[PDB]
Amino acid sequence: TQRIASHSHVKGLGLDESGLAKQAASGLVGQENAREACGVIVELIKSKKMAGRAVLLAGPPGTGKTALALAIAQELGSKVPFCPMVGSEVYSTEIKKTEVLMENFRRAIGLRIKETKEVYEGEVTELTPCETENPMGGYGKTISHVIIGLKTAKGTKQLKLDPSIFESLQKERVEAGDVIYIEANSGAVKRQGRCDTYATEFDLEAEEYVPLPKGDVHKKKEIIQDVTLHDLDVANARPQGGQDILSMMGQLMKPKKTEITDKLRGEINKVVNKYIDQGIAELVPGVLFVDEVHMLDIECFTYLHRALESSIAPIVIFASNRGNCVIRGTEDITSPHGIPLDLLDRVMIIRTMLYTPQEMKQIIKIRAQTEGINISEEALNHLGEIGTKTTLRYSVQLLTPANLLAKINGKDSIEKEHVEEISELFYDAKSSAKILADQQ
Amino acid sequence: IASHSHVKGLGLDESGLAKQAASGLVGQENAREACGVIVELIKSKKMAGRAVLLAGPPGTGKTALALAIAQELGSKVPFCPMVGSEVYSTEIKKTEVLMENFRRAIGLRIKETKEVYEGEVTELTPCETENKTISHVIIGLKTAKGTKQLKLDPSIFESLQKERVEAGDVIYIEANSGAVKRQGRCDTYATEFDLEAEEYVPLPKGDVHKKKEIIQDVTLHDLDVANARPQGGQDILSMMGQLMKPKKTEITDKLRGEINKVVNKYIDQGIAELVPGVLFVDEVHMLDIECFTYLHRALESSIAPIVIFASNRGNCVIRGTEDITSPHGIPLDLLDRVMIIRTMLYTPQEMKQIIKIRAQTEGINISEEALNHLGEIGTKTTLRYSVQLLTPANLLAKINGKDSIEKEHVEEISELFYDAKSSAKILADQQDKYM
Amino acid sequence: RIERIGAHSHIRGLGLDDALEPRQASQGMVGQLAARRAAGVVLEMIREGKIAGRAVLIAGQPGTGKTAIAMGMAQALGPDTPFTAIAGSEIFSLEMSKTEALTQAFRRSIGVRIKEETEIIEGEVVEIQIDRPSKVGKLTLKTTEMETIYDLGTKMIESLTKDKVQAGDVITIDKATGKISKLGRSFTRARDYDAMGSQTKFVQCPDGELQKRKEVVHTVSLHEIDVINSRTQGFLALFSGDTGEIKSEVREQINAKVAEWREEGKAEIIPGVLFIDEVHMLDIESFSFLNRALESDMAPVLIMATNRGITRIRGTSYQSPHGIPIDLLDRLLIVSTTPYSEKDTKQILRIRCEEEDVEMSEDAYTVLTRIGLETSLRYAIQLITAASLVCRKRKGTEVQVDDIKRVYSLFLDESRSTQYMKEYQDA
Amino acid sequence: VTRIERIGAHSHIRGLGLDDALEPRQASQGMVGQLAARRAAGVVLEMIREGKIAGRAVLIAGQPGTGKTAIAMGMAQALGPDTPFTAIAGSEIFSLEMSKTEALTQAFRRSIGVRIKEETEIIEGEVVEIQIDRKVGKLTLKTTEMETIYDLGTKMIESLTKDKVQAGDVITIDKATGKISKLGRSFTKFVQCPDGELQKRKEVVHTVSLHEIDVINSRTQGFLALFSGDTGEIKSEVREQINAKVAEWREEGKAEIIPGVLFIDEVHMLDIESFSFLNRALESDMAPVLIMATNRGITRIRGTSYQSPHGIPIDLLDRLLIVSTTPYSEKDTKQILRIRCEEEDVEMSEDAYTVLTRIGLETSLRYAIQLITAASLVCRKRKGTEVQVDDIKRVYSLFLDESRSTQYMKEYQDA
Amino acid sequence: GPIITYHSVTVPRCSRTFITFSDDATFEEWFPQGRPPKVPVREVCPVTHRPALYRDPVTDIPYAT
Amino acid sequence: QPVASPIGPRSPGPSHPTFWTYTEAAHRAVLFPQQRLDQLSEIIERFIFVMPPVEAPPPSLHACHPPPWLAPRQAAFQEQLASELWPRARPLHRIVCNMRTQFPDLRLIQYDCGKLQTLAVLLRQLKAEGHRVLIFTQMTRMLD
Ligand SMILES: Nc1ncnc2c1ncn2[C@@H]1O[C@H](COP(=O)(O)OP(=O)(O)O)[C@@H](O)[C@H]1O
Ligand SMILES: Nc1ncnc2c1ncn2[C@@H]1O[C@H](COP(=O)(O)OP(=O)(O)O)[C@@H](O)[C@H]1O
Ligand SMILES: Nc1ncnc2c1ncn2[C@@H]1O[C@H](COP(=O)(O)OP(=O)(O)O)[C@@H](O)[C@H]1O
Ligand SMILES: Nc1ncnc2c1ncn2[C@@H]1O[C@H](COP(=O)(O)OP(=O)(O)O)[C@@H](O)[C@H]1O
């Protein structure tokens, strides 16, 4: 299901082949200086060369920071990981502030890994030993091979296995006329019960009789995993299973992150390199979108430009909304953009301009197209006009209730009177502020 | 490695007067001859809860005298060096740290006797019986003296099973703790197999059944935390150390009361011997008002040890109050319960001879000219800064091919490195450029 | 292999000579002769490790190479010497106190290397026999020089069956424990050659005597020791989040036992460095503890980078230089870093662009130095890769002045954004 | 030789030196002067021993060091054992594992004892033989006057097989539970055998407080009070029903409650939230008669900028009785110093006593009490026997005081 | 007697694997013995000829409705 | 059971998609606690030496005349708990031993006797050369 969101209209930056932003494309309109600025960092990400780079989307509220910020995830595509987070998610009750930053830093660095494994399936028809002519002294014959016949929907083929496979089979306690599972690369043999096709009657036992496996007896298909560094970190951190009583502590919540860096410089961060150089995994460095960064504490800001200096770190796309504002956690500090001067010195700021009536009108048209509203040309013009007064948010939010009033009034398109009636039932921030100031 | 090793005693004459140059301590003669009375009181084992406040400007030896006090009493009495920042614990109550440190500064030397079973095990036949649990176990240990059979509880057999032991190996058994270790198989069977994963240890000597007295020295906090966080062998209560293992808060009836009663029962029967300690709470000037107010009842206790505080501030706002200030950053109610000891600020000659003493500590051969120039460089700065341009100076001299340190060496090392005062003016000049 | 380059990956160590004389632009370090010489002196003091409990502070203008000098020291120090880099804000944890975090940080830079002389065997498996019924068997190992036959025991047979090695495998047999570590396969294959199986790979067989006495080494940090010794939770020192060490019952015992080991010669010492970046974040209590934490033989040297001037100390209202109280500032001697000049910034940009494998014209260098001297150095360094992308997008070869000038207008460094912040966005 | 308890700051205090009519003597039982406050302490002690009018609070005010804690220690000593006297500092309620109000009500419950009587039968003799027939057997016990056999039942044989007790061990056997305890191996640990009867009925009384009962009736083996593992009991569910069950024990002949005593030292540390709880916790039946002290006057209340006597709000200040202590004179100070010297092994001269009294009236009283032992030890340094004036002067020079150390601050230190 | 010897050999170059039943060659087949393939089929009911889903405990006759 | 863990759950066979989704290489990237034991065995053995200065019995026992149903139920509870977790706590026995008691590490036998160091140096070469030694002592205790 679609479930239309507030940003389900932005499909991309809308840049041409020469890197110049179109006036209106891929849902975005205007902001050419910004959509071209934040387009270079897309190639920066697609290079997988730099680490710890940062770009700051600094502009007034409602200019489109989040609009063209998550649109980069569209241009980059879903293949590369994209970890969004608001500045209020750092404050936690079970994990220190400066640690949520690191945890999110490693969640943005993806690591796709590929493996190929042969597979065997089908009803085992017979397992007869292959004779070895008295390898030791005159005690008895020896199993040099074991002829196994596997039946499948395609065909039945006889195969030889090693004597160790024979021992594994004997200790596995399987019989003939059932379905087994063999993996020659590792050697482990798994069982899938008997063959539901002919082996079981109407009996009740849920032995999980697998139907006659359909397909070739031998099949190979590369498994492509998509694991992040944070996922493997938490895995090595919060083990699973039903043994090793330390792991049996499944009753406790165990939210206990703050992965010690020993486990970073040691495990997965190292086996990642040992798999990449081995030709098994391909690192997929992602993006770390941190909006409302002005909410981070002074400690968080200080740790930010220490983790951003590490060779293992993704790009960062900040979105600062406050102007010259006091840093949270300190006093009598008037750093611009609510970000310390030291950190602003490390980020590349992209200034988004203020939308003109025509650009806001285009945005309203696009949002109406996305929501599926059949807004008329008069209603659109009046919406643009009443949106030039207030912000773009209130202007473009008057499409769903107006459409409801239309449908209720026997209509199929928003008319000039519908948005006028809705404009009186609901008002924006400035109107409510004036009404409050007039009252007590 | 030496950081505060130059101090090895108060360096006092038999008459208590501080020997000007002795024990690697020079200067602060009054403070040292005063700490002499403190150490004499500590060795008396008569008073409890007496507090001392080593007050003075920074780098005046108060901590040096505090460590010399420990060096004077020796390693026999307990000494607990604690900083005022250890009370602000997040996993346990703030006053809990203070009370457990007061309890931890009290020693307890308790001679104990324990038995030991050892030797080469011959066979292990678990006596079977219907309950249908194993009743007992007969184990035969062969030693150089002789071979004897003995019956132990099923718990010891279970422990042996945990060790995965077999018949004919060497084992160590303790009936007090019940822990049975696996030293390895007997040594005579080394020729049996060609190569094995087992270790071979010679047939244990002495009688299979042997005892011995052990003169152990521990503290009362050890018993407190052992009774508050129990432990044992083959008991599932150890689960407490996996899901319920935060820092404990021994209740009053346990920290005091029963532990003191059992310790007195051990003492009055001729098995234990009390030894007071010294609680050196350095940087006390930054404790919380709550800590200062609890110190009232903490010191007035008849069990509390001799405390030796060390303040640095002259007059600042007390932490935790935010509005009232007092001398030393300590409230006056607590300041009345301490015997303040001054610490004189070092003079040029005293500082020069301190530098000299510190130089010969970590194997440094400094010339007289460089030594005297260090005095000039020090009279402009703090002693702790001037006493640290010795190891860099020696390392730089080792590079210049000169075995000793000359004027130019310490002049270039005094130029590469700045100090607090000399670096503060550099920032005051460039005020609106450091941020 | 794939670990993308960072802002400090270009420095491979202090560009010093054998006499601690810093070169102009050697080994990635450009200019900054005085601070580099000071760092070289303190590093020579580090590789000696006969005094512990000292500290050295590197102060200067923002963007002058404090963290750069720290990384250079870390690199020139190399492995086999614990180096811990921590920001001042990292100790503010919720599962442990500040003093506990500081103790852990200190003890994480103190290594204990226990030299263990364990005799083992190393040879190519030629044949293995095992009689299952206890079970008994044999083993034959081959090296390039000699061969022999072994009469395996019950436990050796059990271990080899758990490993389930086969002929041709090159393995190492620990005579003490019996652990079988297989390095790979010799020139042997085809278990049946009719069954399925993965690709085969072979490696040369071991040389020299079959049984030889080699030297293993186990290097762990004092923090890891106190950790695994803190409580009986199995396989600690990773455990994903938790350290609650006790002061006396564990810490003092670890120190005493390490001293005893040093006495007899098991593992003497290897001190490290604790680079505490942005130490101005530490609380007054953190400095109070650091005062006496440095007064210990197990207290490794620490390096602090400060950017603040005359500013109040966090946690109180006391103005002090470097945002550090004069109590802790009494021990550490301070090093001053001079702002980079025109030729220094130009060469820094040159090296940083040659690190990213980007070619910039002679006029590109001049314009970028102009920008990085009117603006901060970090912005001029960030403009090296941003300008290197438009060039590629236009199928260029080397960055020109036009690409840099365009990417300069595309972004704002610190002042072109605050000067334009004249719209009263929010406050 | 040296016990866990030594010569503290309140050892001389052996109790209130009052007559049969609560009239304080000039100096008795280690308490000097302080007539008015000491007799008020006597009145409160008497009405506590009465134990009818519960829920009363008293505040011992006065200048710093005016025996405000000495009066409380004397009251504790006079009340004697078998009556809970809980003493805690105002800072001890600030706990991380439990809320301040919960800690306060916990201390309240701890300050209330419950008297229960038992009629168990305890055996006390020496083992002669133990038998096991794999199971039943027989047991023969011995005392200095008689010997007897015993049939080892299931419980007895099991417990004696689990325990290593064997022949020739003086032991005790509680026939109710069967707990075995050996007090010494044999004749001469070794200890002689007991006397009198082997099996004799023994009355046992336990003064368990409501806190102990609550902790016993909260969880499976809930007796974790030893380390206060509990973070707070369930109010009104496991805490109100225990009160009803105790009232059931009472007025039936099963148990009787013993009103304890609480002494919160330095109450000015308690915040406004703790005072608010006291305003209602002191109005219940099971509420102890507490005492408190504070050396501050009208200071700020922890929590707001309000100024109130003792740093305590007016709502609670009008809810308690104040007991002010007057400053000591030369006579009282000298007598206190003499009693302190008698507590220790020091013996000062008369002129030394006068000098020490002058020194203690100049700066403060506690300073002289502290210098007592310092001068005693300095006398032993010169190989003397009596503490002369010269030793006290040497000490006064060596060890500084609050007022003289503060004035020496003519050199600026950190701040 | 009951000896089952596992023997791995480095033949020529290439590693083979043999498992010999030194006790008796018959045990070479005794272990991989059996091969009882299944041969059931639906037991159509006698009343409506529908595919049987049950078996009356009294009659033992398979029925479906 | 594994919600977002990087390794897959129990795969009953290939017929369900869940098998062809998790690589074994990624499975080796996560170490279970017993695998961490196998990794750390060396340092676990050669660095775990601390012991509690005091070790009191587990229970803070309580004398009483309790009801007859309490002690048997508590005994059954302990029996239930022990029979289940101890088989799973066995792997931690190795560390509990080192944490329980501490014995000489056999390195001091040679270190605390100089003449044994030269003897070690000599026997090493004599065995490398293929010789066989006869060691004579007057003392029998010295043979130990
Ligand atoms: N370039 C754009 N094209 C189309 N719509 C836009 C654009 N920029 C902003 N909007 C609209 O404005 C609304 C609010 O903008 P948003 O990005 O949330 O503000 P900010 O990022 O400044 O907080 C969005 O719901 C979006 O539909
Ligand atoms: N009596 C003394 N003799 C020699 N050196 C001293 C003495 N007192 C202090 N010092 C020197 O001063 C330095 C710091 O002293 P410290 O104990 O820190 O004083 P404070 O506790 O006042 O800071 C030490 O390195 C030591 O060498
Ligand atoms: N000595 C140096 N040699 C080369 N580059 C340097 C040097 N010092 C600083 N830089 C450059 O300056 C940038 C940031 O410097 P930084 O370490 O942040 O200085 P500071 O620690 O004073 O803030 C780095 O990207 C680095 O390339
Ligand atoms: N009535 C008295 N009898 C004997 N000694 C007293 C008496 N009153 C006070 N003292 C002594 O004077 C000192 C006063 O200190 P203290 O009462 O503890 O101060 P505070 O009550 O303010 O905590 C005590 O150490 C005590 O020994």
- DSSP-assigned states of every residue in B392-427: HHHHHHHHTT-SSB-HHHHHHHHHH-B-HHHHHHHH
Is residue B123 located within the same domain as residue B149?
Answer: yes
Tell me the nearest-neighbour CA distance from F139 into chain B, angstroms: 14
Asked which of A319, A337, A354 is the last residue of a domain, the reply is: A354
**Could you give the CA distance from residue A24 to residue A28 in angstroms, rounded to a whole number?**
6
Ligand 1 pocket, residue A33 CB under 6 Å:
no
If asked whether residues B322 and B249 sit together in one domain, one would say yes
Could you tell me which residues are beta bridge partners of residue C13?
A: none
Resolution (A): 3.2
Domain end: B226, B245, B280, which one?
B226
Query: Which of B294, B323, B345 finishes a domain?
Result: B345
Compute, in angstroms, the gap from residue B63 CA to the centroid of ligand 2.
7
**H helices within A354-428, ranges in order?**
357-371, 377-389, 392-397, 400-408, 416-425
Is B121:B167 a contact under the CB 8 Å cutoff? yes
Q: Is F78 on the interface with B (CB under 8 A)?
A: yes
Q: Is A62 in the pocket of ligand 1 (CB under 6 A)?
A: yes
Q: What is the DSSP letter of A318?
A: E
- Do A140 and E31 count as a contact with CB atoms less than 8 A apart? no
Dihedral over alpha carbons D53, D57, D63, D67 (to 10 degrees): 50
Q: In this structure, is residue B435 part of a structural domain?
A: no
Give the number of domains in chain A: 3
Extract the annotated binding site of C for ATP: 60-67
Q: What is the 3-state secondary structure (H, E, C) of D345-380?
A: CCCECHHHHHHHHHHHHHCCHHHHHHHHHHHHHHHH
CA–CA distance, C296 with B6 (Å, rounded to integer): 12
Chain A nearest C-alpha distance from F85 (Å): 7
Structure tokens at B224: 């407190």
Of B3, B194, B418, the CB nearest to C52: B3
Structure tokens at B193: 């197999």
Q: Give the residue on F whose Cα is nearest the Cα of D119.
A: F65
**Identity at A56, one-letter amino acid code:** L
- Distance CA(D179)–CA(D163), nearest Å, equals 10
In a domain, B413, yes or no: yes
Rounded to whole angstroms, how far apart are CA atoms A265 and D109? Answer: 53
Ligand nearest to the CA of B299: 4
In chain D, which residues have their Cβ closer than 8 Å to the Cβ of C326?
Answer: 414
Residue A45 backbone dihedrals phi, psi, to 5 degrees: -70, -45
Does the annotation list B245 as a binding residue? Answer: no
Instruction: Please give the Cα distance from C183 to C174 (Å, whole number).
Output: 14
CB B401 within 8 A of CB C28: no
Q: Do the beta carbons of residue C139 and residue C150 sit within 8 Å?
A: yes
* Residue at B134: amino acid letter: I
Residue numbers in the known binding site of D are: 62-69
Task: State yes or no: chains D and A have 3 or more CB pairs below 8 A.
Answer: no
The burial class, CB within 10 Å (0-12 / 13-18 / 19+), for E45 is middle
- The closest of B62, B49, B7, B314 to C292, measured between CA atoms, is B62
The three state secondary structure string of B16-50 is CCECCEECCEECCHHHHHHHHHHHHHHHHCCECCC
**B308 and B368 share a domain?**
no
Domains and CATH numbers, chain D: 8-112+209-328 (3.40.50.300), 329-415 (1.10.8.60)
Which residues on adjacent β-strands are paired with residue A89?
none
Q: Which ligand is nearest to the CA of C7?
A: 3
Residue A319 burial by Cβ neighbours in a 10 Å radius (0-12, 13-18, 19+): buried
Tell me which H or E stretch contains A50.
Answer: none
CA distance F122 to F119: 5
Same domain, A280 and A361: no
d(CA A28, CA E53): 63
Please name the residue whose Cα sits nearest to atom 25 of ligand 1.
Answer: A6
D360 CB burial (10 A radius; 0-12, 13-18, 19+): buried
Beta bridge mates, C260: none
**After which residues do gaps appear in chain E, with C to N over 2.5 Å?**
12
- DSSP run (H or E) holding B12: none
F108 touching C (Cβ < 8 Å): yes
One-letter amino acid identity for A409? N
How far is Cα A369 from Cα A348, in angstroms, rounded to an integer? 34
Q: Quick one: A216 and A365 in the same domain?
A: no
What residue's CA is closest to ligand 3, atom 27? C352
List the CATH number of the domain containing B183. Answer: 2.40.50.360
C17 burial class (0-12, 13-18, 19+ CB within 10 angstroms)? exposed
Interface test mutation site (partner A, options F16, F32, F36, F81, max chain A beta carbons within 10 A): F32
Q: How far is F61 from chain B (nearest CA, A)?
A: 11
List the CATH number of the domain containing A387: 1.10.8.60
Note which residues in 38-77 of chain A have CB less than 8 A from chain C.
40-41, 43-44, 47-53, 55-56, 58-61
- How many DSSP H helices and E strands does chain A contain? 16, 16
In this complex, is the C-beta atom of E13 within 8 Å of any C-beta atom belonging to chain C?
yes
* Separation in Å, CA of F59 to nearest CA in chain A: 22
Q: Is D30 in the pocket of ligand 4 (CB under 6 A)?
A: yes
| Cβ of A269 below 6 Å from ligand 1 | no
Residues 6+ apart with CB under 8 A from D124: D143, D170, D171, D172, D194, D198, D200
Query: What secondary structure, in 3-state letters, does E15-40 show?
Result: CEEEEECCCCCCHHHHCCCCCCCCCC
> How many A from CA of B58 to the centre of ligand 2?
9
Decide: D64 in ligand 4 pocket, CB within 6 A. Answer: yes
Atom of ligand 1 nearest to the CA of A367: 27
A263 & A348 share domain: yes
Pull the structure tokens for residue D111. Answer: 């300050």
Residue reference for tokens 């302490």:
D41
Residue of E3, E26, E27, E28 to mutate, testing the A interface (most A Cβ within 10 Å of its Cβ): E28
Does residue F100 sit at the C interface (CB-CB below 8 Å)?
no
Residue D286 near residue D260, CB atoms below 8 Å: no
Neighbours of D175 (CB within 10 A): 11
B117 falls within a domain: yes
Residue B42 in contact with residue B66, Cβ under 8 Å? no
Chain B contacts of F52, Cβ < 8 Å? 222, 225-226, 231
User: Quick one: A250 and A208 in the same domain?
Assistant: no
Q: Which two tokens stand for residue F134?
A: 């006869």
Same domain, B244 and B391: no
Dist CA A143 CA E28 (whole Å): 7
- Residue B414 is part of which domain span? 346-429
DSSP one-letter string for D150-206: EEE-HHHHHHHHHS---SS-EEEEETTT--EEES-SS-----PPP-S-SEEE--EEE
| Contact criterion met (CB < 8 Å) for A246 and B243 | no
User: Cβ F62–D179 below 8 Å, yes or no?
Assistant: no
Interatomic CA distance for residues D62 and D13, integer angstroms? 19
Distance CA B152, CA B150 (A): 7
CA distance D339 to D32: 9
Q: Do A341 and B242 touch (CB under 8 A)?
A: no
C256 Cβ neighbours under 8 A, 6+ residues apart? none
Q: Name all chains with 3 or more CB-CB pairs below 8 Å to chain E.
A: A, C
**If you take atom 7 of ligand 4, which residue's CA is the nearest one?**
D67
Tell me if C324 sits within 8 A of C313, measured CB to CB.
yes
The ligand whose atoms approach the alpha carbon of B342 most closely is: 2
Q: What is the largest CA-CA distance in chain A?
A: 111
Kindly report the backbone phi and psi dihedral angles of residue B326, in degrees, each rounded to the nearest multiple of 5, phi listed first: -150, 165
- Minimum CA–CA partner of D174 in chain F: F65
Q: Does B434 reside within a domain?
A: no
Closest alpha carbon to B224 in B101, B75, B46: B101
Are B419 and B407 in contact by the 8 Å Cβ rule? The answer is: no
Q: Cβ of A70 under 8 Å from any chain E Cβ?
A: no
Distance C71 CA to ligand 3 centre (A): 10
Please indicate if the annotation marks B219 as binding a ligand. Answer: no
**Element holding A362 (H helix, E strand):** helix A357-371
CATH number of domain containing B16: 3.40.50.300
For D227, which residue in chain F has the nearest alpha carbon? F60
Identity at C222, one-letter amino acid code: L
Question: Are A359 and A433 in the same domain?
Answer: yes
Kindly state if the Cβ of A192 falls inside 6 Å of ligand 1.
no
Q: Report DSSP state, residue C7.
A: T
Same domain, A144 and A2: no
Contacts of A175 in chain E (CB under 8 A): 34, 36
Q: Which residue is it, tokens 């052990």?
A: B214
Q: How many CA atoms lie within 13 A of A224 on its CB side?
A: 2
Residue B375 CA to ligand 2 center (angstroms) comes to 16
C259 touches chain F (CB under 8 A): no
Query: Do residues A293 and A412 both lie within one domain?
Result: no
**B144 with B191, same domain?**
yes
Question: What is the C-alpha to C-alpha distance for residues F20 and C311, in angstroms, rounded to an integer?
Answer: 60
